[PDB]
């Protein structure tokens, strides 16, 4: 219980940040790889719009 409690705040802040970031986008993220493909799509949209 104490180990999980120590881990908790970091995980909770991470979850909140991730939820805000994904909701800002139309997509919801679920994996590190998925974040990487989102970055690739971001780069594609950037290189187009420029």
């Amino acid at each position: 219980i104490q180990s999980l409690t120590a881990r908790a705040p970091v995980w909770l802040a991470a979850q909140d940040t991730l939820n805000q970031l994904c909701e800002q986008s139309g997509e919801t993220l679920a994996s590190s790889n998925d974040v990487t493909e989102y970055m690739q799509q971001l780069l594609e949209r950037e290189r187009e719009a420029t």
Binding site: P9, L12, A13, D16, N19, Q20
Partner: protein, 50 residues
């Protein structure tokens, strides 16, 4: 000897009584703030569960 323990039980009872008023007053105060903050404030803005 046991009458002393009975008196200690009475002391614990009064302490419980006190904690109980504290808790009920806290919930009474909470009620209204929940009711107002349910205008999207509590959804994610105020409730920084971190």
């Amino acid at each position: 000897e046991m009458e002393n323990v009975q008196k200690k039980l009475r002391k614990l009872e009064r302490d419980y009584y006190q904690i109980r008023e504290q808790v009920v007053s806290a919930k009474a105060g909470w009620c209204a703030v929940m009711r107002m903050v349910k205008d999207n404030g509590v959804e994610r803005r105020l409730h920084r569960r971190e």
